Design a protein around this ligand. Structure first.
Ligand SMILES: *[B@@]1([O])O[C][C]([C][O])O1
Length: 261
């Protein structure tokens, strides 16, 4: 298709490896580019950890208000929100918001701990029918993004389907789903990624990811004004370990997808 030729050209121009999955919920049609190749998730994995905690809260009704102590030892490499609460507490709701909206790595590690380790995050993925997602490590080492390493990867197709289920489907309870959507819509890190390739009138909720090997990711739910929502996953990684982030590639892929409808 025209869109796949343009995505392939974008990829060729970029020097890296691009993975795209679009789901149009209007007719359940899919557009895939390297849709079944594995990519390092980096912080896009935080959506799964937050959703897993939300699932727990369907039975433990007060779970999200549980306070969790932030100690100096908990701080890792990127903790914009947790740093503000060292020697204090944050609720699991505040940690979920911080992980999603600021990509806080300490918050992610607390969510992983709440789930019993990376295996508990992966278990949630399996429980909602995602056989591809795997979380193997905690922050910050899950971002090493080593070529060929299957740890902490998923495929664009799998992540698109899972994000659809979590946000637009009913993998979560009604209140939990709405909370996740609210959190994603309030993301603060996504202005230069998928959002930048789309009409300004469209509502977007997204989660970015960045890691070594210039890994630059964004996963989004998109609500166009007067039109069925779309799920768009854009993963990008590069051959040099110290490569710079390329958020412009994700914006461009989004623009190409948006043009083609
Ligand atoms: B994710 O990818 O978003 C930011 C942090 C940086 O360690 O991880």
């Amino acid at each position: 298709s025209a869109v796949q030729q343009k995505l392939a050209a974008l990829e060729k121009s970029s020097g890296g490896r691009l993975g795209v999955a679009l789901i149009d919920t209007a007719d359940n049609t899919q557009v895939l580019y390297r849709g079944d190749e594995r990519f390092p998730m980096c912080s896009t994995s935080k959506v799964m950890a937050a959703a897993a905690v939300l699932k727990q809260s369907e039975t433990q009704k007060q779970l999200l208000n549980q306070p969790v102590e932030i100690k100096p030892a908990d701080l890792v490499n990127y903790n914009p929100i947790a740093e503000k609460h060292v020697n204090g507490t944050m609720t699991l709701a505040e940690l979920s918001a911080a992980a999603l909206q600021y990509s806080d790595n300490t918050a992610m590690n607390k969510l992983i701990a709440q789930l019993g380790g990376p295996g508990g995050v992966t278990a949630f993925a399996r429980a909602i029918g995602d056989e591809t997602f795997r979380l193997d490590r905690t922050e910050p080492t899950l971002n090493t993004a080593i070529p060929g390493d299957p740890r902490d990867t998923t495929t664009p197709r799998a992540m698109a389907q899972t994000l659809r289920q979590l946000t637009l489907g009913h993998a979560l309870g009604e209140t939990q789903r709405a909370q996740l959507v609210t959190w994603l819509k309030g993301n603060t890190t996504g202005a230069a990624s998928i959002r930048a390739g789309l009409p300004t009138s469209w509502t977007v909720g997204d989660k970015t990811g960045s890691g070594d090997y210039g890994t630059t990711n964004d996963i989004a739910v998109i609500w166009p004004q007067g039109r069925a929502p779309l799920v768009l996953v854009t993963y990008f990684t590069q051959p040099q370990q110290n490569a710079e982030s390329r958020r412009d590639v994700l914006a461009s892929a989004a623009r190409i997808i948006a043009e083609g409808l």
